[PDB]
Design a binder for these strands. Structure first.
Ligand SMILES: [Mg+2]
Ligand SMILES: [Mg+2]
Ligand SMILES: [Mg+2]
Ligand SMILES: [Mg+2]
Ligand SMILES: [Mg+2]
Ligand SMILES: [Mg+2]
Ligand SMILES: [Mg+2]
Ligand SMILES: [Mg+2]
Ligand SMILES: [Mg+2]
Ligand SMILES: [Mg+2]
Ligand SMILES: [Mg+2]
Ligand SMILES: [Mg+2]
Ligand SMILES: [Mg+2]
Lengths: 179, 259, 39, 148
RNA sequence: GCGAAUGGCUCAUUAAAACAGUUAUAGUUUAUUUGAUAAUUAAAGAUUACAUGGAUAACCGAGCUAAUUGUUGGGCUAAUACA
RNA sequence: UAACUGAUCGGAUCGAGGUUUACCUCGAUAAAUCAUCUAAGUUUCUGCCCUAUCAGCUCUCGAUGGUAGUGUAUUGGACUACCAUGGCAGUCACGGGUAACGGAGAAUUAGGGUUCGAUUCCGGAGAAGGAGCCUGAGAAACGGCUACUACAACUACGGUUCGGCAG
C-alpha cells in the first residue's frame, strides 16, 4: 500500500539545441573555471537563476504599489542579499535580472573555499569540502554545492579534521610499518 | 454509499487543526456531538498537538480513561478521544486547574485562550432557534446545542447570551443589531471582531451583514456567521492574538521585522 | 427524582409567571410614561 | 567529558512528569550512550536516575551534538504505570517479547471451529504473557524496589 | 449487547448519466453523541411491587454420517434474553 | 372539542465510595418525543469527447400534462384507473463510437493553445454474469443467504463446502 506524499522536482533543464557550438564552449569554459564535474551542474545553476527572474518578471507585471509586489518583491531581494548576489545599493527589482550565472556560481562552497586561500585550487578545494575538511555555521558541510550565505561566510574552517583536529589516516597506516 | 462514513484522512482533516501533513494517514474523527465536524476540536487534538500534555496516541488513552478525570468541558467530565470542543467553550484541565476558551485565530486556526477562574464561570452562547413547545412553555436553543426552558422573553432568534456555568443561569443578553461587537465563527473572514454596521435581509434565502473594527476595515459576511461577542463596543471575552483583527501580510512584516 | 420533576417545573413555571406580571406591569407602565410627555 | 543543555520543558501533572528536549555536547567522543546521558541529566536535575527515562536521539552529521527527548517521573510507581511495555523490557524490568502473531492466528483456526467444550482447553495453551501477568511483574518491581 | 453496511481493491458499465460548482427538502429516514422533556399506566382483565411467570445455551449423558464452525435427542440452573 | 387503535412511551435492571440509624454521594445501562450532531435518499440551475455514410424521436401501454387512489421514509406516472394529447429537436433532438468512470489535477506553454488523467483526495459503480432476499438505524450487501448460467473444493457417489483474491 504505497501512498507517498513527499514532493518531486527536477533541478535539471535540458537545452533545445543539443549541439550549439557557441553554447557548449561557455559551459566548458565554465566547468573549468569553477571546477565543476558535469554539464548538469551548469544547468542546475541556470535553472535556479530562472526561478528568480521568472519571479522578477512576474512581479514587474504589477503596479509599483501592489500589496503583493511591495511584499514579495522586497522579500525576494532580501534573499538575494542573504546570499549576497546584489549589493546594498542595488535594491530595485530591475537589478534582479542583470545577474550573471557567473556571479551566482561564485557564491558556492566550492568557489568560496578556494577564493579564501583555504585551498591550492578550484579543484584542490573540491576534494576537501568532500572529506569533511570543512565546517560551516555550527554544522559541517560536505556538499560542494552549498549556497554560502553572507552572514555565515565567517564560520568556515576544519573543526576536528586532520588539518586542525587530530589526523592519522594515511599517517597511521604509514609510520607503523616503517620500523 | 455503503452506509455512513466512519473514519477520517490526515489529508482531509481541517486546516484549523494545524495538522501534521506527513503525520500518519488518518486523524481522530470528531464524535457526533455539540459542534459540527469541521467546526470542532476533538480532545485528542486538544491535548496532543495543542497543549502538548499528551504526545503519543496511547498518552491520551490514559488521560481520558484514567479513573482520575483530568478533562472538563463546560463544567462536565469528558472521556472521549474525540469530543468536539467547539467555539466559545470552556475546557478545564483538572490536575492543573487550567481554564481555556475554544476560539479561532484571526488566521482561522483553533486557539486556546487561558482564562482566569473568573471568566471560566461564564460562557458565551448564541441563539439557534426559539419556539414554544409542550404545555404552553417557551424554549430557546444555543449553537452549543443547549436547550433552554423558560428563557427571558425579550430574546429574538439571532441573540447572544452570557451564561453563568456555575449556576446554569443566564444574564445580560444582546441581539445582533446595528451597533454591536461580533466574532465570526467561520468564513473567508473568521476570527475577526468588529462593530456591526447594518443587516440587509434579502429573504430570497440569504441575508448579509457588514462590519468595522480597529483600523476601521470593511467586513462582509452572512448572518449565520455572526456571533455577537458583545453589546455596544465592549467585548465580553478576552480575545486571542491581541484583538480580533488580522494584518496585511504587509502589516505583519512591518510589525515584526519592521520593514 | 420522578417527583422532583414536576416540582422543579412548578418552581420555574410560577417563577416565570411571577416575573411576567412584573415585566408586563412595567411594559404598560412605560406606555403612559412615553405617551404622557407627547401630550 | 560531555555537556548537556536542557532545551524545551513542559510540565504534565496529568501523567505526573516533565517532558524535556536534550542537547548533548560530545565534541570529540562519539554519540553518547543513553545510559551515560541518563545520569549526567539526573545530576543536573538532582533526581533518582531510574525515575528519569530518555528516548529518541540523533546526531548532527558529524559535529558532536545530539538531540533527544527525555522524561521525568516523580514516583517510579507512576513511571511504572505509565511507561510503555517496550520501554520496560529496555531497562530489563519487564523482559521478553515472544512471537504471538503466528500461534494466535493458528488458535483462531481451531477455536473458530469448535464448541465451548474444547475451546476452554485450547485457550489453556495460547502463548503466555497475559496483561494480568504483566501487572504481577510490574507489581513485583514495586515492592522490591525502594531507595533515593 | 454492539460491530460486522468502516475500511481495502478495482474501473467493466457510465456522455446531462455519473460528476463538479451550485440549490432545495414547507417532499424525507438517520443506531451511536450532545442538550432537554415528562405528577396521571388506557378499557375489559388482572393485580406482588419489598418486585411476578415460564423456557433454553454453556454443563451432564446417549447418538447418527465417509464427510464440514452438521446436528438429533434426554436431564440441569441466570439474566438488561424472553414473557 | 369529538371518537378511534392500543403493536408508542411512562425502568420488576447494574455498580462503586461513604456512613450508628431514620441512610448518603457519584456513576452504568435500558428506553419514548423534541432538538442536536452524523450521514443518506431524492432536487434547482449551468457545464462534457468523436459522429448525420444518425433527422425526425417518445406514445399498445407511459410518452407529456390533469384527475383520484396505491406505494414509499417522503415528493413524483414511481405503479393502478379515468381523461386530455402532449413532451424533444439545425441554439442538433433521437441513434451510434469511445483502448471514456467525472472532478481535484498531470505533461509542454511568450500569449492563446495541444494531449492526458486506471491510479493516495472527493463523489460514483462493482465484486464471476445476473436477478431475488434475510437482517438491521443502515446495505440488494456481498470477506451474508436463495435460484439460474458458467465454474472452484471433498466424496464410502447417499451427500457436503464459512465455494469467489477487482483485500
Ligand atoms: Mg574524520
Ligand atoms: Mg469514537
Ligand atoms: Mg430558508
Ligand atoms: Mg499483544
Ligand atoms: Mg442535470
Ligand atoms: Mg432439553
Ligand atoms: Mg455498599
Ligand atoms: Mg397524489
Ligand atoms: Mg451513446
Ligand atoms: Mg477522458
Ligand atoms: Mg476511491
Ligand atoms: Mg452526492
Ligand atoms: Mg492479489
Amino acid at each position: 500500500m504505497g501512498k507517498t506524499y513527499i514532493n518531486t522536482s527536477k533541478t535539471y533543464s535540458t537545452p533545445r539545441r543539443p549541439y550549439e557550438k557557441e553554447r557548449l564552449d561557455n559551459e566548458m569554459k565554465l566547468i573549468g573555471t569553477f571546477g565543476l564535474k558535469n554539464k548538469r551542474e551548469v544547468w542546475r545553476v541556470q535553472m535556479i537563476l530562472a526561478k528568480f527572474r521568472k519571479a522578477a518578471r512576474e512581479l514587474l507585471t504589477l503596479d509599483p504599489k501592489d500589496p503583493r509586489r511591495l511584499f514579495e518583491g522586497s522579500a525576494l531581494l532580501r534573499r538575494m542579499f542573504k546570499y549576497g548576489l546584489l549589493s546594498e545599493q542595488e535594491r530595485k527589482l530591475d537589478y534582479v535580472l542583470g545577474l550573471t550565472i557567473h556571479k551566482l556560481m561564485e557564491r558556492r562552497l566550492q568557489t568560496r573555499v578556494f577564493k579564501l586561500n583555504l585551498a591550492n585550487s578550484i579543484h584542490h578545494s573540491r576534494v576537501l569540502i568532500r572529506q569533511r575538511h570543512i565546517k560551516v555555521g555550527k554544522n559541517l558541510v560536505n556538499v560542494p554545492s552549498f549556497m554560502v550565505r553572507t552572514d555565515s561566510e565567517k564560520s568556515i574552517d576544519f573543526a576536528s579534521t586532520s588539518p586542525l583536529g587530530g589526523g592519522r589516516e594515511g599517517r597511521t597506516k604509514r609510520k607503523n610499518a616503517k620500523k | 454509499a455503503r452506509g455512513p462514513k466512519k473514519h477520517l484522512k490526515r489529508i482531509n482533516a481541517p486546516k484549523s487543526w494545524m495538522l501534521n501533513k506527513l503525520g500518519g494517514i488518518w486523524a481522530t474523527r470528531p464524535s457526533q456531538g455539540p459542534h459540527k465536524l469541521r467546526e470542532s476540536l476533538p480532545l485528542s487534538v486538544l491535548l496532543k498537538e495543542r497543549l502538548n500534555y499528551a504526545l503519543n496516541g496511547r498518552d491520551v488513552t490514559l488521560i481520558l480513561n484514567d479513573k482520575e478525570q483530568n478533562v472538563f468541558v463546560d463544567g462536565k467530565v469528558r472521556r472521549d478521544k474525540g469530543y468536539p470542543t467547539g467555539l466559545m467553550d470552556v475546557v478545564r484541565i483538572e490536575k492543573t486547574d487550567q481554564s481555556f476558551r475554544i476560539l479561532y485565530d484571526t488566521k482561522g486556526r483553533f486557539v486556546l485562550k487561558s482564562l482566569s477562574k473568573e471568566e471560566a464561570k461564564y460562557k458565551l452562547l448564541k441563539v439557534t432557534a426559539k419556539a414554544i413547545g409542550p404545555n404552553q412553555i417557551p424554549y430557546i436553543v444555543t449553537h452549543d446545542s443547549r436547550t433552554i426552558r423558560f428563557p427571558n422573553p425579550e430574546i429574538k432568534i439571532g441573540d447572544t447570551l452570557k451564561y453563568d456555568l456555575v449556576n446554569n443561569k443566564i444574564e445580560n443578553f444582546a441581539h445582533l443589531e446595528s451597533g454591536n461587537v461580533c466574532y465570526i465563527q467561520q468564513g473567508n473572514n473568521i476570527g475577526r471582531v468588529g462593530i456591526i454596521q447594518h443587516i440587509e435581509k434579502h429573504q430570497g434565502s440569504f441575508d448579509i451583514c457588514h462590519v468595522k473594527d480597529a483600523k476601521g476595515n470593511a467586513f462582509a459576511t452572512r448572518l449565520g456567521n455572526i456571533f455577537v461577542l458583545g453589546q455596544g463596543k465592549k467585548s465580553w471575552i478576552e480575545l486571542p492574538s491581541g484583538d480580533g483583527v488580522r494584518e496585511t501580510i504587509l502589516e505583519e512584516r512591518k510589525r515584526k521585522f519592521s520593514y | 427524582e420522578k417527583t422532583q420533576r414536576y416540582v422543579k417545573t412548578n418552581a420555574a413555571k410560577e417563577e416565570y409567571e411571577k416575573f411576567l406580571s412584573e415585566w408586563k406591569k412595567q411594559r404598560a407602565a412605560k406606555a403612559h410614561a412615553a405617551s404622557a410627555p407627547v401630550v | 567529558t560531555i555537556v548537556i543543555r536542557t532545551k524545551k520543558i513542559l510540565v504534565n501533572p496529568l501523567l505526573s512528569r516533565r517532558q524535556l528536549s536534550l542537547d548533548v555536547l560530545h565534541p570529540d567522543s562519539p554519540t553518547a550512550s543513553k545510559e551515560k546521558i541518563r545520569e549526567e541529566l539526573a545530576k543536573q536535575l538532582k533526581v533518582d536516575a531510574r525515575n528519569v527515562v530518555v528516548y529518541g536521539f540523533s546526531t548532527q552529521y558529524g559535529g558532536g551534538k545530539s538531540t533527544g527527548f527525555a522524561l521525568v517521573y516523580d514516583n517510579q510507581q507512576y513511571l511504572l504505570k505509565y511507561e510503555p511495555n517496550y520501554r520496560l523490557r529496555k531497562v530489563k524490568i519487564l523482559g521478553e517479547k515472544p512471537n504471538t502473531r503466528r500461534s494466535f492466528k493458528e488458535l483462531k483456526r481451531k477455536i473458530k471451529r469448535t464448541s465451548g467444550k474444547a475451546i476452554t482447553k485450547l485457550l489453556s495453551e495460547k502463548k503466555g504473557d497475559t496483561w494480568a501477568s504483566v501487572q504481577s511483574k510490574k507489581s513485583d518491581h514495586l515492592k522490591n524496589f525502594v531507595a533515593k
